[PDB]
């Protein structure tokens, strides 16, 4: 008996900008974004590419690529911090756009960039409890990250959606139920009050909160993983025994910071830690070999899209399995989800034999291939457009766009 992620699909906005064009535009050394942050291309949106449209594009693509029977979906959850109504959830819009049947729970989950994982766990545990046996769930992480012109967070902006298929046939990731570690605390590192279109953030403080919550979540998982015989204090650090580790990527260089911190948790908690110094522990924790073996190949997609909040971690999982699904089959990997506010959860799972099949059907290269580069000038023009003023452009085949808001009702079109 297994449960977890069976397949995934992703949707991206139709436009992007080269990150070095953004630096030049802002009077910033390009190397700060490319080397300092690890960014290559930044997704940019117009009002037509809203949370619903992206979420529905991704979920409709999942059902098509993986040949999902819509009537087997018992749960449709949208994790997002870019909601479009205080009451009506994006999930209900997605249900209608996809013409899905009625025998399913629909709702949205919210906690910054952790909201997707929260919905994933609710779907997993709905199945694992037996309530969802014989059925599947679809959990969509959909967000548009917006910090504003001339802000420190601008180069980490992005947008898109990742639709996750959750079932008793977890071809991508059979998750280890009950082993999750979690760490949460009331903080103001990043937030976006109602009515404000741009987020508020204490940049370097959100990094500290990330690493603090990460440490607690990983340690919680490690304890449970030790008792279940999945890892051990041996010649290898417990975290080294995971084939790969994927982290929430607000920006690509954040994955190296997170991996260093995770390994420090092992080195500081090792029974022989007294024999080491902070200098020796940091040099070992920063091991380039460990980062290359465990993390480096998970950032290909994230570097060309930017921050997608709830979807960043699962874009990393996607980048990782896009190329290494076959090699990772039967191997256990770890995932760290973070949400400003804040909450972190660290969980593990085993990649399935059929993972390569499911990722090939996701055809991620073709998803990224359909985008077009625009100028910073055009990016800014689209940014200033009001949320109810989509561009008069058609969606791609099978994709969705917002067309207008009439009498407070949102209208959408399918390509």
Ligand X SMILES: CC(C)(COP(=O)(O)OP(=O)(O)OC[C@H]1O[C@@H](n2cnc3c(N)ncnc32)[C@H](O)[C@@H]1OP(=O)(O)O)[C@@H](O)C(=O)NCCC(=O)NCCS
Under the rule (CB under 8 A), what is the footprint of a second copy? Answer: 74, 81-89, 91-93, 95-97, 102-112, 114-115, 118, 121-122, 124-126, 128-131, 133, 177-178, 180, 182-188, 190-196, 199-200, 216, 220, 339-343, 345, 408-409
Q: Which residues pair with 261 in a beta bridge?
A: none
Q: Binding residue per annotation — 348?
A: no
Catalytic residue numbers read 81, 113, 248
- Do 239 and 269 touch, CB atoms closer than 8 A? no
The H-assigned helical ranges of 308-363 are 312-328, 355-362
Report the nearest approach of ligand X to the CB of residue 115 (Å): 14
88 contact, one of a second copy, ligand X, none, CB 5-8 Å limit per kind: a second copy
* Residue 253: other Cβ atoms inside 10 A: 16
140 contact, one of a second copy, ligand X, none, CB 5-8 Å limit per kind: none
What sign has the CA pseudo-torsion 147, 148, 151, 152? positive
90-106 burial, b at 16+ Cβ within 10 Å, e below that, comes to bbbbbbebbebeeebeb
Q: Is 298 helix (H, G, I), strand (E, B) or coil?
A: helix
Give the DSSP letter string of 369-392.
HT-EE--HHHHHHHHHS-TT---S
CA angle 88, 308, 405 (to 5 degrees): 35
Q: What are phi and psi of 322, to 5 degrees?
A: -55, -35
290 contact, one of a second copy, ligand X, none, CB 5-8 Å limit per kind: none
Q: Which residues pair with 373 in a beta bridge?
A: 16
349 contact, one of ligand X, a second copy, none, CB 5-8 Å limit per kind: none
Report the nearest approach of ligand X to the CB of residue 199 (Å): 8
Report the nearest approach of ligand X to the CB of residue 35 (Å): 4
The angle, 0 to 180 degrees and rounded to 10, between the axes of the packed helices 115-128 and 312-328 is: 50
Give the residue from 260, 257, 284 showing the smallest Cα distance to 272.
284
Q: Binding residue per annotation — 111?
A: no
> Which parts of this chain interact with ligand X (CB under 6 A)?
29, 31-32, 35-36, 152-153, 155-156, 190, 201, 203-204, 206-207, 210, 250-251, 253-254, 340
Q: Binding residue per annotation — 152?
A: yes
Report the nearest approach of a second copy to the CB of residue 339 (Å): 8
**Largest separation between any pair of C-alpha atoms in the chain:** 69
Cα 15 to Cα 373: distance, rounded to the nearest angstrom = 6
- Do 336 and 248 touch, CB atoms closer than 8 A? yes
Report the nearest approach of ligand X to the CB of residue 262 (Å): 15
Pick 10 or 343: Cβ nearer a second copy:
343
93 contact, one of ligand X, a second copy, none, CB 5-8 Å limit per kind: a second copy
Residues belonging to the binding site for CoA are 29, 32, 152, 204, 206, 257
């Amino acid at each position: 008996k297994r449960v977890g992620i069976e397949a995934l699909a992703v949707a991206v906005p139709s436009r992007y900008v080269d990150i070095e064009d953004l630096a030049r535009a802002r009077g910033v050394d390009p190397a700060k974004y490319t080397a300092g942050l690890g960014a290559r291309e930044m997704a940019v949106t117009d009002p037509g590419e809203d949370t619903v449209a992206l979420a529905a594009t991704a979920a409709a693509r999942l059902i098509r690529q993986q040949d999902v029977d819509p009537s087997r979906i018992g749960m449709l959850v949208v994790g997002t911090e870019t909601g479009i109504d205080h009451s009506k959830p994006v999930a209900s819009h997605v249900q209608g756009l996809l013409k899905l049947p009625r025998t399913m729970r629909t709702y949205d989950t919210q906690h910054a960039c952790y909201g997707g994982t929260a919905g994933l766990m609710a779907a997993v545990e709905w199945i694992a409890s037996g309530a969802g046996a014989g059925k599947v769930a679809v959990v969509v992480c959909s967000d548009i990250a917006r910090y504003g012109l001339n802000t420190a967070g601008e180069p980490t902006q992005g947008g898109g959606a990742v639709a996750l298929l959750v079932s008793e046939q977890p071809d991508l990731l059979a998750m280890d139920v009950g082993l999750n570690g979690v760490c949460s605390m009331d903080v103001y590192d990043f937030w976006r009050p109602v009515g404000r279109r741009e987020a508020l953030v204490d940049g370097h403080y959100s990094i500290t909160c990330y690493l603090e919550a990460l440490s607690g979540a990983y340690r919680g998982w490690r304890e449970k993983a030790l008792a279940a015989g999945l890892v051990r204090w041996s010649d290898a650090l417990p975290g080294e025994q995971l084939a790969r580790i994927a982290y929430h990527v607000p920006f690509c260089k954040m994955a190296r910071k997170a991996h260093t911190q995770l390994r420090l948790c092992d080195l500081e908690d090792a029974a022989d830690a007294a024999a080491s110094t902070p200098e020796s522990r940091e040099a070992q924790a920063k091991s380039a070999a460990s980062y290359d073996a465990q993390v480096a190949t998970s950032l290909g997609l994230n570097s060309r899209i930017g921050n997608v909040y709830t979807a960043s971690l699962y874009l990393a999982l996607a980048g990782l399995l896009q190329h290494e699904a076959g090699a990772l089959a039967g191997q256990r990997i770890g995932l760290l989800s973070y949400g400003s506010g804040c909450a972190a959860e660290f969980y593990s799972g085993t990649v399935g034999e059929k993972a390569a099949e499911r990722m090939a059907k996701a055809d991620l290269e073709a998803v990224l291939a359909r985008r077009e580069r625009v100028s910073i000038e055009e990016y800014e023009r689209l940014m200033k457009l009001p949320a109810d003023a989509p561009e008069a452009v058609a969606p791609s085949p099978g994709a969705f766009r917002l067309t207008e808001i009439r009498d407070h009702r949102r209208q959408y079109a399918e390509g």
